[model samples]
Target: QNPKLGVSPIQDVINAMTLDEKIQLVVGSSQGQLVQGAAGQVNGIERLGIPATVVADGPAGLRIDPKRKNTDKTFYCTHFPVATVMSSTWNKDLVYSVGTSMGDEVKHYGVDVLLAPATNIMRNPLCGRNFEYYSEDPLLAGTICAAMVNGIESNDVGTSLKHFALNNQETNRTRNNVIGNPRTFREIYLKPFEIVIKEAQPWTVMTSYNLINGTMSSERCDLITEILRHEWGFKGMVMTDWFGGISAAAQMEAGNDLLMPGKADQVKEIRKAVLNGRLSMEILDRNVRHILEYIMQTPRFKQYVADNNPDLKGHALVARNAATEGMVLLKNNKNVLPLVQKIKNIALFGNTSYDFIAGGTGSGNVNHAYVVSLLDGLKNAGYQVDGDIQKSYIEYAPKAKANLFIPEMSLAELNMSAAVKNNDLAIITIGKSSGEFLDRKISDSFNLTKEEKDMISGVCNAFHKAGKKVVVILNVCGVIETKSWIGGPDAVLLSWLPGQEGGNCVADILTGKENPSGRLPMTWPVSYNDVPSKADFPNPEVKNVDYTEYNDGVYVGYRYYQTKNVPVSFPFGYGMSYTTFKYGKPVVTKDAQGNIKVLVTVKNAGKVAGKEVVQVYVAAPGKDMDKPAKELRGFAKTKKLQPGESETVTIDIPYKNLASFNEVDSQWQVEAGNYKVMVAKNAADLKPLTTVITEEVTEKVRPCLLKEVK
Candidate 1:
């Protein structure tokens, strides 16, 4: 060892250790499974002051077990809103607050890294894990995830900011081959991760369990070393998704620092690779060095003790509030919501009222103390629920959960006809749950079941004939077909997997205690057939292993919808509120340093108080290359405003952010043109608000031949 300077103790340790010793640190500790509730751990040399790593799963909350073995005292974490719902809020600071508490929980639960804020793009609606991700647009996804990462890391722990890139589907993910041009990868698929890496600088990152153009993700040097590290400047350890990579040697060669849920056989395999000259010593030592750097930032390495108790109750309120802010009102006619004076008795329909889903399954699942269902929330909101209706469901709940369920559809058992006759108003709930390892079927999660469709139509007709309004609640984990059946209901609420406090949240939104403000992060198409990736998705040519060509290029989500003039059921950023707001003319200006600032005033035009997401879209002139019709560049959410109250919001855009990837030369460029700046209520409303003329500008990010080029 050169020195004990402590200033460079990590490097010194790397120099001092033998290859075998370094190997131990580079891979996960064999004892990772021993750490109760830990997702994975990297046991380092204790004498070197490098302690073991402790990471836990969760896009929603810390994923450790609540009970501590035999004793059974609780250490429940607050189940927060899923990432999609949080993104719908369009309120960055609130997500930061959620991230703040989530990070604190990571530390309190003795975890060094919280494997969350999964930053994958919503390329399609059928992604099983879409509930755990952020949005369809990179600007929104990047902005929100950056805020979350900053908030979580502020607590002295780390957020993984996971599934590194292009992990859009779940079916056969382990063997899925993703094919896309370099430009598409940088602009659409990789933009969010780059934003999170640059802005948040998460302590660690987890690779997706898939291939990038026939090459394993963790083994791709072009992704990890060139694009991610050199160009994007990611300063963290790169680890694999659990059992993600097929070749340990290739992973090390790519500079992937750690293998998760690491094993002894793999360690031996890597050792042989090094001995046989397949893996370089420099690369092996580099991986070890990155691991040391990672552990140093952790609570354990710093000798920080945890109480193992987080503020569960306080966080539940955060979850409740966050979920309320994201509860999007898709359609509300005649102001049927807010049950404002409670003139009519309520009739609750569907099995979801009794068994609500607070989150998704698999890695995204949270171990919670309890989840409050919509029915419970209504009762708590003091809505007059008829005893017979409540009893029918409550009595049928256990049987349904245990799969007795037939009572769920029976007219008399469900008390449907009785509901139309006795209750003045109807509230129907439809829940669709999704998770990892399976893509949603077009006939199932994406569309309503025949029973649900029939129920909605029947309920709407029965209620309408009596002149009573019918309300529908979509407590879903992912996007579902709404245009087909939504016209029937007088009101519709998309409460996308609200957290443990979901019951209270829905209650707040429905009773007018809270006005619905959440917007759609993804476009709700008229049908899945209209989705841009509908044909090429999941690559139908093969069985378990397949290859997909991202023929849409940069035209993902709103880009495709806007540029192609695709008519959607509800556009991106669409939402309704109890109140209304009017947007003022935008004032645009540019500084010498190439910074653009747009100031716009928003006024609440209705009686109730509420917030609004002020959005900015950029239309490139397309003089040099083909571009999207308009791209979301900047957005700001207004403070809650009372009627006649106005607030001016400022959005700052660095001029160079407009540059598209120059795939030919592997650079970034903004062609000289007059770019239109549009202020939109949603993506579909593309009327220009202003314009800014820009000169040609180029950024030489990095120059290298992309491995995916064919």
Candidate 2:
């Protein structure tokens, strides 16, 4: 650990710094380098003993550019599972391991801050960057991301919790005005960030590219200075997203300390503004002090060296373990999984069976040594794949590689030779792709093509008719139309873009070496029409979309389904295991500090051993206003248990957290009514217990006034 510097040294350094040196501390040294290794680098003043700090693109893994080789050294980082899959595990400890390993890699590469753990709320399924985020529920997103931040910082590395507020959609992201209700923003959009700030206390926070309620996030003092700094007490540097197009003077005045992928013109503007009294010296000093504090904590400043060659093999195991835990078993009929003693011959279908998408496109992409495909994984498990099917895809792989943006697979024809039909079981893999700067098409993107649908129906019909069981593997980044063709497959596994070791981890699940424990982080809709956001989302006809109204305030994901009483293909927090779990009566108790704790005993009632996630949700009394049926507050997972083995899980829910943001009163208020505490596996499924508070609880908050920047 680096020796902690007192407050005096930081002020002394700032006092001696010239205007140019202070300006240099706030912006990057280059431009348009938001990829991975050299995304945003700022060289510190060498005379003051401050070392250069580098920030990398790492919501998933270290995305070092393969082409840009460092001087006399090369680095290849591991590609871990996507955020959706990581959250699917519903295990905070496992996510912590992912963060810890990522921290180690960043330290080895001499990177000071890994700009990741993107805590943006998943408001809609069609969002292009959903793969990089965690969940739709604030409790889950907050708890999961907080653990991740702790793990990253535990290794003495800095983390950047990002996209400050309402960075939901990628459509017209740069210039779009996300005008919406402040109540929705407070409860749904900003809750996770608030949780991370109070719990993990990351070293930096990055602003979103889009405008929030007509104000740019980089220049919103109400958000950066008032809420983030004054309200939540976040003592960290605030950096803007890559080329976020903010005036240097406005950003500094608003308390946003750094401009990424810096432009010389902007740096000069900051200096000019300071000299002309347009920007305050006090604000500039605060920014410089934060930067120096961050530098002092890095290894470069203390040890003057970095370990470029980290243990790749150990990190690979960490990635594999995380992927294994994140694999959710969406369907299982007649126990078709855990394939009895592994048959020698298995028929593998789909493009991803051979060429798997390790991660999503754009910034989330990682440079890894290799990605293990499903076929390779099965081969490692000692299963023999049909040579004919492998040969057919191998021949078609070249045509599919022509375009990366749009999918180009001809599922119109299948060889279905005698070799494929002879296998007793067939594993059909379906793949989908989405990325940054690209929104999914409603018709073809979310729904399957006729040809693809026919292929699934045809393959399942042929295999089922031939008396062979069919297993379908969904290798995708987001939700798709599952209800349409779900019945065809005897079993289905939702492996949502598991990382480099995805193939091996999936193979482990198929062969019964690992039991599936992952749950859905978001609701899987029956159809695209059922989605509330679909009505006005991605206004493709216009260059800039106006989201002035939040039409569905505070009702996102499972909350929308429950509030509207609509059915989904698969509900949030829903997943099946190899074994069944039985829950005992819940025991509730409250402490003097208003901390409510619930204890539920879960027993493994089935013959096989497995794990279960116990979720606790709070249903606020609808005395004054309308609210969702319930909101998830706390959750806990049990260790692997054998038959008849039981584990008692304890969950704590603070009384203050049960309060809803009362817009009329301008405070978070808990109604003077009986509150029902429900426990379940997911949002749709629940059992309730009652608790009452005599008086209404209220916490007043003062938000910074929104001002127009001319």
Candidate 3:
């Protein structure tokens, strides 16, 4: 990965980078962050050794600047767990060990291309950076951002994979336009950046701040030179989601290799688009050799020597084992939650139990020194909170600290009778927050706000009128519409933004010491009017989206409520588990090189010890395949099992992922027969589990002409 081991060759350093040093080495440093807390760099020629890579900001982790200006010793980093609760722990080796512990703080913080892993596609539920995006299915947001871009490019750093094609609506995000349907942008929004640049070879690719059909996703040359490098092969380097797109020579004639925060007139609009031939020194030296071979594989081009105190307490136990396997135990009902031992006293009640939203708010927000406050993870999990409801929420957290991004509990009555006298249970958190630009508000951030629905039906009618037990949680970062007042909670959880050991992962899933097995990466509606792009997602007409008709092509979310049956309160790969699994039936096959596998056996059927995912849906045989009533092509996750322990999990799936694009001869068919296959427990629970046959075929290629000022 350090192929520049010899340093002198990148066409002999782009043949001595001059043309104003190759237009300031692909234009970036408008005299800013030449290094210190970088978020803008590259302009380094330093007499010819070509260096400066230094980028930053992103994926809920390293957004730099913890206090620089020649240090007082503070760099910080490690916040993890926010890509929609790391794609709700559908574990790809726990998001590849949380992308190698955020590539060990982006390779010891020397930095070089981290700008995140925002695989945007939580397509709509008030899209405002759906808490730094991850799902709403693009095969689970392209296999969890290609295992976090192969876990932050396996530590040599370099992991952007972001906004690229359709900046899904931060409400007119830098000049909106997105008008869809090219097989719903390759089956649901450029299918997770074509499954993370064809399986994670990410070394940079940001571009996106609006414009899809009328163009401008960094001036798209049909999405960076014909479908991200000649139909989905992707070599690297794309940049620009900082100051994001708008004719810097049509983003370097649309191959867009670099043009971010730096702009001294975009190096005079790329030296007048190559002195006026309208941009092309062979596409400006092929986008300056993809920004000088991605700044010669940087840690600042291998100078490397950074460690400004990075362990952040062993990455907070890898951010509490990737947020205790994605915290989502939605609705525990009578069991209330792991909080047992005769439910030893607890009554945390809202205001994020003291101003805590571990992540979300611009550039995926993360500076972090501490964030564990569900009343200090329930007094460090021993529990006995309610000291006058934690002193009236630590005294209503300093007058709700000026709407600390939507926070309030406005005192006005009996502290629910001393929070149900001495507290046996009555959690109640409910915080919601949006990021980047703005999009949440269907009254109190996507429903629930007659004071968070009377503080969850008045703390569940004052903890079931003192028979005790009431849970709520939702400290959200997105997805909030829990079916008109969670019917007096007995338990709900969700915990979406769990970075920085998020109050000890909500005190290790309410104290059973972690066992939620998170799942529900989008789709929890019972209103947003049963959202199917609720009649044009963000273009309710304002002269902004200039006709923003995303006309619900790939039906969006559980493919439009499991194909128009529509009745979700929580469905697409839903959750709730304190232990209980039992699959054992699937065993399909198909290899001779067409792939398909499946296998499935999973059994840890109850008594304590968890982890199980399985999933694998598919239905397509109906009157000639129109797709999506059951899509998710494959899934697997298990390895904790115990009581009667079992585990045969497999899942593979490939044969062109069961084809079917054929938008009237644009090509990619596969409509033969009996292809039902179910292997279930999500996408509205299935089980059929067997069927594989194929015959008709055709897969031409290249004709979605993606667009953006071409």
Alpha carbon lDDT of each predicted model: 0.80, 0.79, 0.75
Q: Which stretches of candidate 2 lie over 4 Å from their true place?
A: 1-8, 31-36, 67-73, 400-413, 417-420, 539-548, 686-698, 705-710
Among the numbered candidates, top lDDT falls to 1
Give candidate 1's whole-model lDDT.
0.80
- Candidate No. with top TM-score: 1
- Between candidates 2 and 3, name the one with more favorable TM-score: 2
Cα lDDT over the full model 3: 0.75
In model 3, where do residues sit more than 4 Å from their true spots? 1-43, 46-53, 65-70, 73-117, 122-187, 191-223, 227-284, 289-367, 377-466, 472-489, 498-521, 524-557, 564-662, 665-710
| lDDT ranking, high to low | 1, 2, 3
What would the TM-score be for candidate 3 when compared with the true structure?
Answer: 0.36
How close is each model in CA RMSD to the real structure? 2.3, 3.1, 21.4
User: Where is model 2 poorest over a 10-residue stretch in terms of lDDT?
Assistant: 1-10
Off by over 4 Å in 1: 1-8, 30-35, 68-72, 397-408, 539-545, 686-688, 692-697, 702-710
Ranking by TM-score: 1, 2, 3
Winner of 1 and 3 under TM-score: 1
Q: After superposition, how far is residue 330 of candidate 3 from its true place, in Å?
A: 6.1
lDDT of 2 by residue, 1-710 (tens): 22233434555657777887778888867524333454668676766666677788787887676645435655688999888888899899988988888888887776778888898888888888888888999889988999999888887778886588778888878877776666788888889999999989999899988777677878887888888888789887888888885577878878888788788789778878988888889988887777766677777677635667778778788888788889899999998898887477988877778888788988878888888999899889998888877888877867657655334345454576563455767887888878778887666557887757777888888777777888888988889998989988899998888888978988999988788888888999998889887764774325236543467878888887986678799998999899888887876776777668788889787767789988887776578877888899898889988888998888888877877887777678776667677788777874444344443444677754332457
How displaced is residue 596 in candidate 1, in Å? 1.4
Instruction: Name the lDDT value of residue 353 in candidate 1.
Output: 80
